[PDB]
Symmetry: D2
Subunit: 487 residues, 4 copies
């Protein structure tokens, strides 16, 4: 394709860095496009543009903002198939996923927040007959989002929707792995009537462009999605440079707890969806599957049956439901984890190699992989792989499985499979995770706040509360009585 540019103040503009990078189609190894990289001057230009756009945007009525975001939704729906194809080329996720999830649920969140703008309200507190307090929920101003590569456009929508709905301008940095759909979104927003500067997109390298965003003194908040290690670097710099509010959605090693009374067909289906969707590149994946020892062998058989139905192939084919990983460097990291599982004694139930033959030799494929006989000290059990690698762990009692599920620095998601009323709520209330599913996995409604305990995040996305977290409270006291000085 054409050499992709930055998007600043409602037009494509050349980067003033003189630097570029390439994004690879993970199914072929070919270069998709050359992308310009925003430097320090590009960030300052984006910020000044955002400051000018934010004032226009905040001065509109709440319903005027609502209508513009809803027009963007209508465009996204109409262009769902077009945007999904570009997403498939950039990420390697099958079209069967991208046309059905990536833009649909991105738009859903934009649609949800568009409707809530008129309900964003402050408070009023009487103190006494002669004084009262009222609060305003004011825009932060200019905020920055740093996106991840697994759900490029959805992440762009989940960050920009609450930010814009709260009256801010956002500067969005997509992942260097997958920058292309973020730039389409910027065009769609302008077409919908978003004022220039309110959504600027700055492709680049995280070591450079992201750092320049976190360091800029006129950016009031950073929202980051990525791996735990990368988050720790981002969060520090947003302190050492200028005091920014922060939200982080990091990785996890989420547990899936199968109870003794669970149906094993349901449990196996839930476990399949918790591990192999998007080729296992999902932060909320239930990679640690805890199963009663009494049912281990049966559950293993049901997992192997379902793994055999997985259909890798042409990513634009209707029946394809498994794709390559996002890049060859990521595959190398995933294969190193698979080899550490072999060396540490875990039993390889299936997969564990790359895929071979016509149409796979040129892609970044890893076969769906399952380890069993896993113990809590193994590398594959303690660390996030971010690939299609399920770990099966046997357990004996409910107290044990709760301790083991919680004995981690990760805290993102968790789930339980049981038909019993008391067991479902009782187990879930004791798990240390922000996103808990009972008898399901992966559904993430716009209404539902999501985010991590412990090392898996700071703050939340989605829900009414995330709209509020993109505002800052101003408290105003009206003193109508006589003021008394003691001097």
């Amino acid at each position: 394709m054409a050499e992709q540019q930055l998007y600043i103040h409602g037009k494509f503009v050349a980067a003033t860095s003189g630097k570029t990078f390439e994004t690879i189609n993970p199914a072929t190894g070919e270069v998709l496009a050359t992308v310009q990289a925003a430097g320090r001057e590009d960030v300052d230009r984006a910020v000044k543009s955002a400051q000018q756009g934010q004032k226009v945007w905040a001065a509109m009525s709440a319903m005027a903002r609502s209508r513009i975001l809803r027009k963007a939704v209508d465009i996204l729906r109409e262009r769902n198939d077009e945007l999904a194809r570009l997403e498939t080329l950039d990420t390697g996720k099958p079209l069967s996923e991208t046309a059905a999830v990536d833009i649909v649920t991105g738009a859903d969140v934009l649609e949800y927040y568009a409707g809530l703008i008129p309900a964003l309200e402050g408070s009023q507190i009487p103190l006494r007959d002669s004084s009262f307090v009222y609060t305003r929920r004011e825009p932060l101003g200019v905020v920055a989002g740093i996106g991840a590569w697994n759900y490029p456009i959805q992440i762009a929508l989940w960050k920009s929707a609450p930010a814009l709905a709260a009256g801010n301008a956002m500067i969005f940095k997509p992942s260097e792995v997958t920058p292309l759909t973020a730039l389409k979104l910027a065009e769609i927003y302008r077409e919908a009537g978003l004022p220039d500067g309110v959504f600027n997109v700055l492709p680049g390298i995280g070591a450079e462009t992201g750092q320049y965003l976190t360091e800029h003194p006129d950016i009031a908040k950073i929202s980051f999605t990525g791996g735990v290690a990368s988050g720790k670097k981002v969060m520090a710099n947003s302190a050492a440079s200028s005091l920014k509010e922060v939200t982080m959605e990091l990785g996890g090693k989420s547990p899936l707890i199968i109870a003794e009374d669970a149906n094993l067909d349901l449990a196996a289906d839930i476990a399949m969806m918790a591990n192999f969707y998007s080729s296992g590149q999902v932060c909320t994946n239930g990679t640690r599957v805890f199963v009663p020892a009494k049912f281990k062998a049966e559950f293993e058989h049901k997992i192997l049956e379902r793994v055999g139905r997985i259909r890798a192939g042409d990513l634009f084919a209707d029946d394809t439901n498994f794709g390559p990983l996002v890049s060859f460097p990521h595959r190398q990291n995933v294969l190193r984890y698979i080899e550490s599982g072999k060396s540490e004694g875990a039993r390889l139930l299936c997969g564990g190699d790359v895929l071979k033959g016509e149409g796979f030799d040129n892609g970044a494929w890893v076969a769906p992989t399952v380890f069993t006989d896993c113990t809590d000290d193994m590398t594959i059990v303690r660390e996030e792989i971010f690939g299609p690698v399920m770990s099966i762990l046997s357990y004996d009692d409910e107290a044990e499985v709760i301790r083991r599920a919680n004995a981690t620095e990760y805290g993102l998601a968790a789930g339980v499979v049981t038909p019993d009323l008391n067991r479902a709520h009782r187990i879930i209330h004791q798990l240390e995770a922000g996103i808990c599913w009972i008898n399901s996995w992966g559904e993430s409604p716009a209404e539902m706040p999501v985010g991590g305990y412990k090392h898996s995040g700071i703050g939340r996305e989605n829900g009414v509360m995330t709209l509020q977290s993109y505002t800052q409270v101003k408290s105003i006291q009206v003193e109508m009585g006589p003021f008394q000085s003691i001097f």
Copy 2:
């Protein structure tokens, strides 16, 4: 002298294992108030283990049981107000006329406020479809840490611990090395009210050691810090490099006080006095940039000087003393450095500008109430927080100009406007970039009112209902009662 002060861990005083101690000074005399043990790394580990155990007991209690215990602590604080204030006056140098009327009174107000709200802490329920719904729990973070500042020691300890405890957490609190004594008394008061052991632990120590150990501990879920802007950046950084903690920060400001062209100048002068010289200027919210219309400036200066001349320094226990020494001699040196930069940069000194001298003052860390006028926005005393009794008077010509100048700063804590006009008061306040805004007053901080800073003056908020919620974390739970459909 007081006896050597120990750490407070798991409902009792206990000796530090650091082998290190420090002294706190009475700033009015220079004398050593007490020797205080410093908590080392192993002491912090023991406090966290203690907090984890106590937190489980506390959170398993009913909401109303937690409420009643905090209300008992409020009753003891009200009963012991005078004794606590006298101790705070000894440790900080603030006049008893302040400490007995403000510090514990408004500290206990916030604990009392949160005690009543514990039963209203509620999650949500969201129906997705006939066969599925979501509900949320507002769960405790677990063990949280509070790091206090030295200017309002017991008020800060209450403002941090009250929402943390009311939300079901345990707090480990580290008082400032300058002012450790009242925090240890508060720990005893909480236990006497029935707080389970381990729920409020107190670790005196130095920022570079005890503070850093807390911000680095893997099993602490949140840090709440009050202090200077520079210290905040270091605290905020370690709380990420170690383990990904939630953070609240209340830092300094350079807050503007805008006097409008229709303001009564006696009211403006009274507000400006209270915005600058309470607690000897050692208040983060002080209105230290006073913007006055050019046509009123000379008359305003005259009113300020008349009021400055009423300021009564002296014995901190005397009823009519309303001005105290600064908290320490190193702090006074910093304040004097700023006063000297004001002189050398061409600001006009109208009064003060020197230490106080004579019997009763030579051994205290006293600085005279100081006013500069003819200040410009580039001067160091206008741009930087001084945390001493130093007012800067800036003239201005029109409303758009003063709004731009008020906002042209990295600080963002407080602001105020003096005007009897309805439209001007709201219109100006709405354009100021600050979290705490006062119309025709200054300084009042009701328990119900969230307070904190824009921009570099803070992260998060204190007080109000929202701060109780910020000491919980949300767990979303989806109940799927329909058949699950796998694509595989």
Copy 3:
């Protein structure tokens, strides 16, 4: 004229089985606009059974599916704004300059507002102990009934149906017999937007029959009524005696407009004009008691006379017509009786007071805009709602006095104050006994702002987030996971 108008039940027009009909007139010309079928007792029962079936389909859809449908209705209303406004002008006699700028615009604004809040309607979750918790659902009421008034026919239909439908209910709407035509158009618009059949049914009729059959029906869970204070007392009685229904009532008022001594009198006169002579005085919230300081009363009177001379009665479709006839000859007769009582009781007639005469006026029920002054609190025109273009000017001496007299009334709908002074505006407003309070303005009713009456002016509220919640009912659900203990 137009074609015969039928009932709208279950997505289609359908003949009434009552056998009865009535005519709606054009109040500008006296000509029959249309013959309209009246809904009988069996027609209401059919409508309820339609509504019940539709409601289940509606409630089972996702929140965003409901939101998208109401937004499609909004878009249609924006597109047809001018045609619907012209029809409203024909049926009510209000000038097109009003109907095309306010009536549909602000009715659709409220529908748009509630469409977007549907996904935010949430219950709560309340932990009791480790072994038990409570969660709540905001469930639909089921079938609700709205009874409209004639002064703002489609705006009222939208302000009632929008939160009811957004909350998951079906609504049966009975428009006023004076003004049924736009409600029928709205029912068609809803179906065209995708509203399921039965979710909004429209039953024209007389109040004595169709209205009474709705209030008595046992499967209707809520009645929302807009109209006169007297008609309200009757509806509220039958909605308890027959079957216990939730009730919302928006009745009239005698709202005070308080002009302070510091007020600019041109602004005060403009506000008073807009508070009395819009929609030819046929507005429940009108500020018909104008309190003016004794010292400025004469000057204020001259300013009113000057503005009243500017009122332009004439062709209702002409752009510069800003004053219309009253809705009917019987209503004008009542306004004329109040005017005559003003003259007999000693009020001083400042202007107006008579029917309008001449070509173009002899066929409609026009009354000249009327102003009384030298009024006293005991006069009939001061004590009772007239619902016509009749302003009463009252003099006052002090602030406490005017607050007493503004509040000495069984009405409680609206109030306002004119003053540039910050303290005076909030101080006075906080003491007035009224649900809708305007400072330095009048009449604006944003979708976000709950509006409704104190005392005899109403029950409940319309608009705002709270009215969406009020069209749901709370179900509390306790999940007990511990072993239940019986004492038997």
Copy 4:
């Protein structure tokens, strides 16, 4: 016989001027407990004027000052629990084992809950545009009236007065003529706690006279009524025909207990017992229609009979007694006519069905615990609320059917399901038309949990945060800072 009981008006006992009195009986012995004066029409007006004066004092206080006064009342109630419980037992006939553990304890829990929420009662602020904003105030209604029922006299008086006082109102409370004594004690306790004179007045009397005078008075803004469905329709009607009052009603029910096919039948029998025979069946929320699968009906009947055998009637002050007489002898006659209607329609009497006889029973209004089985949906004992110790057992075949039959009633108060299955429990509860729903339990009513009826079982709710808000009225205030535009 105690001394003739007087009215409680403005902080003191005062004689009625009505000249009328009534008597309250001990239902265990038939003895007269006391003569009680009845409030006349002039007495009601005096109470309203006292309440108007007190409310002004009370609302002028700070939120936390009101909180502390209500907390003092709570402390007195806890201290005086046993004395109050004994009096409640003498007046109502409920065993001391209940009154000492439930009546005052849960009443004081609700007062304690609302005491803590007073400071969190907030309005809203809504920006419209740069030049205008809205804020709301939650203002007191003023003077409100509570009408109490006889089954839980002091608990009801607290559940009505606690939100009403917490919201800044004054309440005039009329206890039930059957049980007037504890309400007079409550009034002295409130005054002893520091409640201002006039804020809580108690007017004993009859429903036809005193109750009606309260519902008619023009200066009472709200009525909250607890009673039977029939009397509620009368009360709600007069509160309209006279003055347009806000209304809350908690009426009776015919609540279903659904036992699932997978329920443990011992747990189900224990829940059914507690849902039918606590307080001798005189509980509006009782699960008096017990639905059991056909395949389990016989086994369940045996389990019910065994637990009925354990019921222990006797001395109401004995520790082991857990069943009492009905509240009055006229109420026993009504309950007996329902029992005879059950026999005459062919319901099978499983146990009970007669008065208790012998020494220590022949003087009390005792009815034996009674269970009917083989019951059908059309029987009188299944369709109508009995308010006595009469359980009806109904067989069913499938889930869809039992949901239809549970919902096929004009009542809507409570419901419950017994099932260990996650999907079945929520799925069923979500389809039941009742405001109060228990899963695997019955009867617990936390202060945090709103309670009230669907359909004919009530209007509005009690308890929860929402009920604090329902005793305020919303005032919307628009501040317009831009130039006002008149079209005239």
